[PDB]
């Protein structure tokens, strides 16, 4: 039940910037993006230690309430007890999550939604700032 | 039907910073703060030209769907076609609103709420930045 933002109307090309602080006892946190809570074109879930994963980013989609296939990244540029910033955009092919220091993750656009109208944060991540570009 | 943010969990003393761009032909816009759409401890409505009023800030509350006693500020530090930032805090007595950028007025806390969990923007005001401190 973390921060939820609706009616974002984030169209392709536009950038969603999110800055927040990661808890010191961080297990994992979640950034959800899509149309609503049941239609997520991006489930961004860095896991420090959660569900057996250690220092692993887990991405997925949810379509009509149904989870898609999990995609995993070896690179884990997140440290517990620190401030994490992500820049998010998308096109017809992929969603792109960029980190300031150069890290960039791609996740296939599986929902093909016209825009991102929904953002929800959860887990050990307290959002401090959100910008729309 | 503008931006809506829920589960803010804004405790007393904490600052809610909101930046957005006011349309050149703006008639009015709204910042709603409270628990939900039916319970607003602050209805912040600058009216450039609306409901017969002009260059007047209209503040009110909504408690259980019912509008409280409307109140107005003689001062109007908003320009159509320009970027406006509003900083908002509250104690158990008043809400404090900081307008661009020397301006500060108190609005009585009439809902007594523990925290601000709900923000909704509307009217001729496209949100570009929201910060929580
Ligand atoms: O079929 C059961 C599966 O369940 C998921 S976890 C589940 O998956 C989703 C992603 O698809 C969401 O992350 C979801 N979620 C998290 C939150 C949340 C809520 C609040 C805060 C916060 F932070 C987070 N809400 N929803 C998770 O519960 C397991 O990973 C998966 N599995 C696959 C592997 C696996 C392990 C090692 C290597 C490998 F390749 C795969 N290790 N487990 C398998 O056991
Ligand atoms: O009952 C009649 C009253 O009606 C309100 S209008 C009403 O006020 C509410 C707050 O008090 C809400 O703002 C409400 N609202 C706005 C929006 C919205 C929704 C979407 C976008 C967007 F931008 C905005 N939604 N809801 C308004 O409709 C007038 O203030 C009021 N009155 C007028 C005067 C008055 C008149 C002339 C001169 C003068 F000095 C005072 N002095 N009192 C009086 O005539």
Q: Where are the beta strands (DSSP E) in B91-124?
A: 94-99, 103-108, 116-123
Neighbour-count burial of B76, counting CB atoms closer than 10 A to its CB (0-12 exposed, 13-18 middle, 19+ buried): middle
Residue A90: which of A61, A52, A57 has the closest Cα?
Answer: A61
Q: Are strands B39-50 and B29-36 parallel, antiparallel or unpaired?
A: antiparallel
Indicate if the alpha-carbon torsion angle A90, A94, A99, A102 is positive or negative: negative
Distance A35 CA to ligand 1 centre (A): 21
Cα B36 to ligand 1 centroid, rounded to whole Å: 31
| Chain A touched by B21 (CB under 8 Å) | no
Cβ atoms of B93 and B113 within 8 Å: the answer is no
Q: How far, in Å, is the centroid of ligand 2 from the Cα of B59?
A: 9
* DSSP conformation letters of B20-79: EEEPTT--BEEEEEEEETTEEEEEEEEEEEETTEEEEEEEEEEETTEE---EEES-----
What A75-80 contacts at long range (C-beta under 8 Å, 24+ apart), as own/partner pairs, is A75/A103, A75/A105, A76/A46, A77/A101, A77/A103, A78/A22, A78/A46, A78/A48, A79/A22, A80/A22, A80/A23, A80/A24, A80/A25, A80/A26, A80/A48, A80/A124
Helix (H) or strand (E) holding A130: strand A125-132
Domain segments of chain A as ranges: 1-133
A15: three-class secondary structure by DSSP: coil
What would you report as the CA-atom Rg of chain B, rounded to the nearest whole angstrom? 14
| Ligand 2 pocket member B70 (CB < 6 A) | yes
Exposed, middle or buried: residue A74 (CB in 10 Å: 0-12, 13-18, 19+)?
A: exposed
Map residue A77 onto helix, strand or coil: coil
The best mutation among A23, A40, A45 to test binding of ligand 1, ranked by most ligand atoms within 8 Å of the C-beta, falls on A45
Residues contacting A118, CB < 8 A, separation 6+: A4, A5, A6, A8, A32, A33, A34, A35, A36, A37, A39, A40
Residues counted in chain A: 133
The reply, when asked if residue B19 is annotated as ligand binding, is no
- Any idea what DSSP says for residue A71? E
| End-to-end C-alpha distance for chain B, whole angstroms | 26
Resolution in A: 2.3
Which two tokens mark A99?
Answer: 């980190």
Q: Helices then strands (H, E): number in chain A?
A: 0, 12
- DSSP secondary structure string, A52-68? TEEEEEEEEEEETTEE-
Q: Could you tell me which residues come within 8 angstroms of residue B111 by beta carbon, excluding any fewer than 6 positions away?
A: B34, B35, B39, B40, B41, B61, B63
Distance (Å, rounded) from C-alpha A84 to C-alpha A115?
A: 24
Residue located via tokens 């984030």:
A10
Bond before B101 cis per omega within 30 degrees: yes
Q: How many Å separate Cα B2 from the centre of its chain?
A: 13
CA B84 to the chain's CA centroid: 12
Tokens of residue A127, six digits: 């959002």
Q: Give ∠ CA B77-B83-B87 in degrees, rounded to 5.
A: 65
Q: Do A6 and B4 touch (CB under 8 A)?
A: yes
Nearest to A59 by CA among A84, A96, A85: A96
Buried b (16+ CB within 10 A) or exposed e, B15-38: ebebbbebbeebebbbbbbbbeee
**Residue B65: CB within 6 Å of ligand 2?**
no
Q: Which residues of B touch A8 (CB under 8 A)?
A: 3
Distance CA A63, CA A74 (A): 25
Q: How far is B8 from chain A (nearest CA, A)?
A: 6
**Ligand 1: does its nearest atom lie under 6 Å from the Cβ of A60?**
yes
> Gap positions in chain A, given as the residue before each gap (C–N > 2.5 A)?
none
Ligand found nearest the CA of B62: 2
Alpha-carbon span B71 to B56, nearest angstrom: 10
Tell me: is residue B77 an annotated ligand-binding position: no
Looking from the CA of A58 toward its CB, the CA atoms found within 13 Å total 18
- Give the architecture-level CATH label for domain A1-133: Sandwich (2.60)
- Residues of A with Cβ-Cβ distance to B118 under 8 angstroms: none
Instruction: Extract the tokens encoding A55.
Output: 């220092």
Six token digits for residue B62: 């909504």
Q: Is B25 left (phi over 0), alpha (psi -120 to 50) or beta?
A: alpha
Beta carbons of A7 and B6 less than 8 Å apart: no
Question: Do the beta carbons of residue B116 and residue B132 sit within 8 Å?
Answer: no
């Amino acid at each position: 039940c973390g921060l939820v933002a609706s009616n974002l109307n984030l169209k392709p090309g536009e950038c969603l910037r999110v800055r927040g602080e990661v808890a010191p006892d961080a297990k994992s946190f979640v950034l959800n993006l899509g149309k609503d809570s049941n239609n997520l074109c991006l489930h961004f879930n860095p896991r420090f230690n959660a569900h057996g994963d250690a220092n692993t980013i887990v991405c997925n989609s949810k379509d009509g309430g149904a989870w898609g296939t999990e995609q995993r990244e070896a690179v884990f540029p997140f440290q517990p007890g620190s401030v994490a910033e992500v820049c998010i955009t998308f096109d017809q092919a992929n969603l792109t999550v960029k980190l300031p220091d150069g890290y960039e993750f791609k996740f296939p656009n599986r929902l093909n939604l016209e825009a991102i109208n929904y953002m929800a944060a959860d887990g050990d991540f307290k959002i401090k700032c959100v910008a729309f570009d």
